[PDB]
Amino acid sequence: EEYAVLISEAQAIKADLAAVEAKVNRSTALLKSLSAE
Amino acid sequence: TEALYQVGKEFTSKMDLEKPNYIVPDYMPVVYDKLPQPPSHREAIVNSCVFVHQTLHQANARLAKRGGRTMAITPRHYLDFINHYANLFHEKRSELEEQQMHLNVGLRKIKETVDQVEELRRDLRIKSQELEVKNAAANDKLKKEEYAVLISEAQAIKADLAAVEAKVNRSTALLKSLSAERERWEKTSETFKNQMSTIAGDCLLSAAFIAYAGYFDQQMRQNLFTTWSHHLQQANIQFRTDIARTEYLSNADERLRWQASSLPADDLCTENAIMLKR
Amino acid sequence: KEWIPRPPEKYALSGHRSPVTRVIFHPVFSVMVSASEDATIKVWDYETGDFERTLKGHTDSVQDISFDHSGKLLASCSADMTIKLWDFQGFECIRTMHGHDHNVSSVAIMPNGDHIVSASRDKTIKMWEVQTGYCVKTFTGHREWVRMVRPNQDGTLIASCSNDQTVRVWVVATKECKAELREHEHVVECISWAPESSYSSISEATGSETKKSGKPGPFLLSGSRDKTIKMWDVSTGMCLMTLVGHDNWVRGVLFHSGGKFILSCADDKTLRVWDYKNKRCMKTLNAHEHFVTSLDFHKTAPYVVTGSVDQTVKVWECR
Structure with missing residues (x-):
């Protein structure tokens, strides 16, 4: 019962991890674009 | 008297001054001799204007009898009186119409808001039902990889429901705050029709005060105002007996500004400032 | 007169803060x-x-x-x-x-x-x-x-x-x-009667028979939300012709000053000019980006105006 709750907590953790990874990639692409500036 | 009545009729011809439900009193204070026997509302208004002009002559005669100092009352006083009457009527009517328009828009917005509160109720119910079925399916399929995906979707639905509940309580807090505002606006909108009916008498009294009562002291200003009010009562012309003339002829911002200009905090001084304004 | 609105416009007046x-x-x-x-x-x-x-x-x-x-x-x-x-x-x-x-x-x-x-x-x-x-x-x-x-x-x-x-x-x-x-069929919204300049034009358009007095009688028309425009005989009360083809609810109807064509608006965001005597004119002309509310035809000038929910009034040239 609680095991499903904790694996779903792990799923939320991976969703946050994916969001952070996407933000990192996007901001790195932005930084590469502003090198000339 | 005939010339005054004709000037009043011709000048106030484009003023509304029409009351279909006007009730002719049994004893009309007939000032103009050739006034029609069943006079209309406009005719009564012009008769009241002529009465005010003659009341100024009576007051000047009384001051002369008591050995006081008097200024001549010329037809230019009557012309100023009717100018002030027309201007005050137009200004008050426009202000009240604009206020009622604003209040109607606000009440309509509040009603749309509460309907949207109901729509958020039904949206929240649907969201809760789908969350219940989602986690029921999750628990069913988890006691037998996609199961993790669907329980993640269950948490997504839970987060959406939490956000919707935050919108729920925030909106409900906003509606409860505007209960007093909506109550006051509804009361004022209901009393709008009564306020429209008293514009003629109130504007007549205020215009007479501005045009005539400038030179006199407070005692005879009050005497003239009481005489005009009694004549309006005898002619069945509606006017407000609750509001003060200083409050009627000025807004609180102007009164605050005048006090910053060292105007004494007196009713007579406020009336004098109003006369210096209008 | 064959005044007919053209797709190009001259002025799109927009001063209203609320739908016209x-x-x-x-x-x-x-x-x-x-x-x-x-x-x-x-x-x-x-x-x-x-x-x-x-x-x-x-x-x-x-x-x-x-x-x-x-x-x-x-x-x-x-x-x-x-x-x-x-x-x-x-x-x-x-x-x-x-x-x-x-x-x-x-x-x-x-x-x-x-x-x-x-x-x-x-x-x-x-x-x-x-x-x-x-x-x-x-x-x-x-x-x-x-x-x-x-x-x-x-x-x-x-x-x-x-x-x-x-x-x-x-x-x-x-x-x-x-x-x-x-x-x-559904809610009737707009009506407009017939000028005397078109009374003769209804006889050959419908085939109605003149009475003993000879006058065709006063004429009617009623637009309705059922996307149908119907012209009616006031004297009798029977149907002459039903004009069908509007996409959405019709809001305004009126007759051409020359009494030859039918010109109307509707919620279909377009103006439609229809012929009834011969069913030849079926010009459809978009007018506004949103619903179109009302319209009018100048008696003598070649101008037509339309009001819409987009808080804009537009004037069309008649050619």
Whole structure:
């Protein structure tokens, strides 16, 4: 019962991890674009 | 008297001054001799204007009898009186119409808001039902990889429901705050029709005060105002007996500004400032 | 005359802060008057598209406006339950006749220029006096909200369209519904009668037989939300022809000044000009980005104006 709750907590953790990874990639692409500036 | 009545009729011809439900009193204070026997509302208004002009002559005669100092009352006083009457009527009517328009828009917005509160109720119910079925399916399929995906979707639905509940309580807090505002606006909108009916008498009294009562002291200003009010009562012309003339002829911002200009905090001084304004 | 609007425009007047409800043409001056939902009536110069003035006496949304034969008075109705009469020389409200419970929908001055008619949600049509302002007689018989009211060319006959699917023609003298028409599929919204310049053009368009007097009789028309435009005989009460093809609810209908073509608007965001004698003209002309509300045809000038929900009034050239 609680095991499903904790694996779903792990799923939320991976969703946050994916969001952070996407933000990192996007901001790195932005930084590469502003090198000339 | 005939010339005054004709000037009043011709000048106030484009003023509304029409009351279909006007009730002719049994004893009309007939000032103009050739006034029609069943006079209309406009005719009564012009008769009241002529009465005010003659009341100024009576007051000047009384001051002369008591050995006081008097200024001549010329037809230019009557012309100023009717100018002030027309201007005050137009200004008050426009202000009240604009206020009622604003209040109607606000009440309509509040009603749309509460309907949207109901729509958020039904949206929240649907969201809760789908969350219940989602986690029921999750628990069913988890006691037998996609199961993790669907329980993640269950948490997504839970987060959406939490956000919707935050919108729920925030909106409900906003509606409860505007209960007093909506109550006051509804009361004022209901009393709008009564306020429209008293514009003629109130504007007549205020215009007479501005045009005539400038030179006199407070005692005879009050005497003239009481005489005009009694004549309006005898002619069945509606006017407000609750509001003060200083409050009627000025807004609180102007009164605050005048006090910053060292105007004494007196009713007579406020009336004098109003006369210096209008 | 073969005046027909063209897709290109000249001015798209946009001064209203709320959807426009009706637009009319001044009888004599080069003035176009638009009533909108922001409780204001605006005055425009359609020849050069210049804003002129606004009449802001109304409290709630203004619904219908109407001039008289001389164009010296403007009668307006609004949702504030009142009829305001405007003096077009000075542009100041002169008489505000009260009564007529709930939202007032339509208003019209019959050509005699001394009395007004008005339609409202209270399921009745009232009859006012311009000179005095008392409602003298009241028309009853409509069981629902009456939408539009239009009189005749000599101040004797009145038609009223309502939500009750009935377009009842009324008589001034007898106050009796001599013609009652309940045949539409869905809500009837707009009506407009036939000028005498088109009475002859209906004989060969429909094949109707003249009576012993020989006159074809007064003619009717009623547009409805069922996307169908139907023209009706006031004298008899039977159908002449049903005009079908509108995509959405129709809101305004009127006849060409030459009495040859049918020109109307609807909620389909387009203006549609239809021929009925030969069914040749079927021009469809988009007018606004949103719903189109009302329209009018100039009696002599080659101009047509349209009001829409997008708070914009547009003028089209007739060619």
